[PDB]
Amino acid sequence: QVQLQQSGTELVMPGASVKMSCKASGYTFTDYWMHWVKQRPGQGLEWIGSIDPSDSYTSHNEKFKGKATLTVDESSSTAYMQLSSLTSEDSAVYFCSRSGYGYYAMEYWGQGTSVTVSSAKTTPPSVYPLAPGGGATNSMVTLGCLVKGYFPEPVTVTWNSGSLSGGVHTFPAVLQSDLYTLSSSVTVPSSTWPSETVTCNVAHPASSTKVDKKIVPR
Amino acid sequence: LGGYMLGSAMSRPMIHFGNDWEDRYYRENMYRYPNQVYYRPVDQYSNQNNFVHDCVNITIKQHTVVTTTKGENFTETDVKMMERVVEQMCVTQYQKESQAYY
Amino acid sequence: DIVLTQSPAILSVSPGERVSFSCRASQNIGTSIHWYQQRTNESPRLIIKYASESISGIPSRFSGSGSGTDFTLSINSVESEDIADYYCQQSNTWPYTFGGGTKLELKRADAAPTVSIFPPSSEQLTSGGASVVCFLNNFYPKDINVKWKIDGSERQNGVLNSETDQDSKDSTYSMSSTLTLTKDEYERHNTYTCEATHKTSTSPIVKSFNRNE
Ligand code: NA
Numbered sequence: 001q002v003q004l005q006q007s008g009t010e011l012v013m014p015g016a017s018v019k020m021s022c023k024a025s026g027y028t029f030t031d032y033w034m035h036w037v038k039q040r041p042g043q044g045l046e047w048i049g050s051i052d053p054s055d056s057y058t059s060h061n062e063k064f065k066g067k068a069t070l071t072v073d074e075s076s077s078t079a080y081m082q083l084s085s086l087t088s089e090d091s092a093v094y095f096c097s098r099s100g101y102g103y104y105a106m107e108y109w110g111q112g113t114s115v116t117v118s119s120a121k122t123t124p125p126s127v128y129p130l131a132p133g134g135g136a137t138n139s140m141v142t143l144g145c146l147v148k149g150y151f152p153e154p155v156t157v158t159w160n161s162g163s164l165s166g167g168v169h170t171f172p173a174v175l176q177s178d179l180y181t182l183s184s185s186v187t188v189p190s191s192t193w194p195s196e197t198v199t200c201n202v203a204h205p206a207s208s209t210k211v212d213k214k215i216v217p218r
Numbered sequence: 219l220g221g222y223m224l225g226s227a228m229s230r231p232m233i234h235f236g237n238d239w240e241d242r243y244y245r246e247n248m249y250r251y252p253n254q255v256y257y258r259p260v261d262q263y264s265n266q267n268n269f270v271h272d273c274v275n276i277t278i279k280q281h282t283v284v285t286t287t288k289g290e291n292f293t294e295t296d297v298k299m300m301e302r303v304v305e306q307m308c309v310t311q312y313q314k315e316s317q318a319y320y
Numbered sequence: 321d322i323v324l325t326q327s328p329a330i331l332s333v334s335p336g337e338r339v340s341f342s343c344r345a346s347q348n349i350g351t352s353i354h355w356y357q358q359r360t361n362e363s364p365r366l367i368i369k370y371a372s373e374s375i376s377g378i379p380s381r382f383s384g385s386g387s388g389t390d391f392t393l394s395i396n397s398v399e400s401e402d403i404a405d406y407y408c409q410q411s412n413t414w415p416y417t418f419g420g421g422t423k424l425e426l427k428r429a430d431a432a433p434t435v436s437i438f439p440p441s442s443e444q445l446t447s448g449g450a451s452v453v454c455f456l457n458n459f460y461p462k463d464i465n466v467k468w469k470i471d472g473s474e475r476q477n478g479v480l481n482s483e484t485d486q487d488s489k490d491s492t493y494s495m496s497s498t499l500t501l502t503k504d505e506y507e508r509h510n511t512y513t514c515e516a517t518h519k520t521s522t523s524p525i526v527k528s529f530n531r532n533e
Contacts, residue, residue, distance in 0.1 A: 033234065033236050050236055052234060052236065054234075055302070055305075055306055055309075057235075057236075057302055059236050059237075102234055102241055103238075104236065104237060104238060
């Protein structure tokens with residue numbers, strides 16, 4: 001079975017370079033072209049460039065020529081792409097892929113390396129309770145937690161240590177002043193809150209952070 | 219002029235150019251490109267890249283004049299493809315040349 | 321450059337329905353078009369190559385046709401696992417180019433958003449910050465506009481929005497909208513309003529709160 005192994009993530013400073021690896025296995029490395037494809041968050045696929053591992057002949061999307069350097073290491077069956085002078089425009093997922101023999105559908109894909117370009121330092125989140133007041137719909141009530149100003153991704157949000165899993169909406173993080181913010185709502189029967197406890201649990205592994213925020217009326 | 223050597227003929231490799239149109243073009247036209255290289259003695263270069271660069275230019279220039287003599291012409295695709303395969307041959311020639319004299 | 325135009329940009333489909341979408345190339349590329357499926361937070365996967373050729377381990381319900389400039393991918397009977405973005409790509413000549421993609425989503429009954437508004441926590445206010453949160457939950461279709469007002473005046477700065485993907489169970493969408501102000505600015509006013517405009521009604525859904533009460 002053909003596999004293409006890529007590192008999950010890279011955090012890079014603006015102006016710095018990054019060299020991403022794509023390690024191939026399960027076939028004769030020099031017999032197939034390898035390709036690199038960019039995808040910005042919520043956007044489409046963009047071809048960056050491709051390389052023939054037999055002699056390291058390359059082809060580039062004109063706009064990446066001078067930005068993306070493609071090489072291989074034949075001995076370890078690994079293809080590399082180095083991106084230089086990174087900006088926030090380079091924040092994206094980068095896939096490597098492999099075509100057929102003398103045919104150019106991209107048959108196998110790596111899982112993609114997610115690159116984040118930022119000067120931010122590791123910052124634990126501030127967690128704020130979102131509680132309503134009195135007038136709250138019919139027999140159901142909506143609570144929330146605001147997870148503000150952390151870095152890097154990700155955080156993990158649960159409700160009541162994961163025992164609440166029916167009516168939760170945890171929204172994708174957004175960039176707010178060079179830091180991340182997200183929110184989570186949970187909808188429950190009014191019979192359950194505030195008569196007993198509803199707590200949001202927020203883990204931020206990078207800062208070794210783990211905070212519980214009990215939602216209290218008013 | 220003078221000082222050059224001609225390598226022995228080499229088996230033409232299967233070369234894949236990365237897209238459907240060029241692969242086919244290459245397969246059909248590859249006979250029009252050299253199967254041996256001209257170079258200066260390896261001792262006369264500071265390293266492989268230098269040897270290869272010159273070997274490529276010399277070989278293509280000479281092949282081009284003989285091709286022009288026959289009334290034929292190379293397109294920009296021809297030059298790109300010829301460059302690649304002659305580069306492969308020059309690398310092989312250097313390796314063999316470097317091994318000798320070492 | 322060969323430009324690949326895919327249409328439509330979004331397709332709503334009902335489970336079991338047969339669907340098709342198209343990829344058109346600006347120049348003739350023979351059969352050099354390939355199709356990829358990309359589910360949320362996954363890599364693309366090859367589904368059909370060279371216009372019409374099947375791929376090992378891909379469901380037979382997928383097929384493709386066309387040659388020249390006009391290509392079509394068809395799904396005989398749509399299943400939930402087919403909900404994904406679909407891209408075409410050409411490999412005839414450099415540079416490789418991709419279509420802009422067609423997103424597949426599940427068709428369901430229209431549903432107005434359940435809207436909830438939240439004032440800043442005392443916690444946040446203590447730090448000099450003030451974020452007003454509005455949740456617009458479980459609505460369909462996806463299109464929706466949110467407007468903020470403070471004491472009647474539309475606010476535009478300091479508003480950050482976030483959208484979920486289509487719900488796997490009920491096929492709805494949700495949105496989060498947060499207006500962030502300085503603690504000072506927040507206290508200079510009384511009334512805060514989140515206003516949701518959705519197709520389900522020509523009447524905007526209004527949620528609001530007054531500080532003085
Ligand atoms: Na199935």
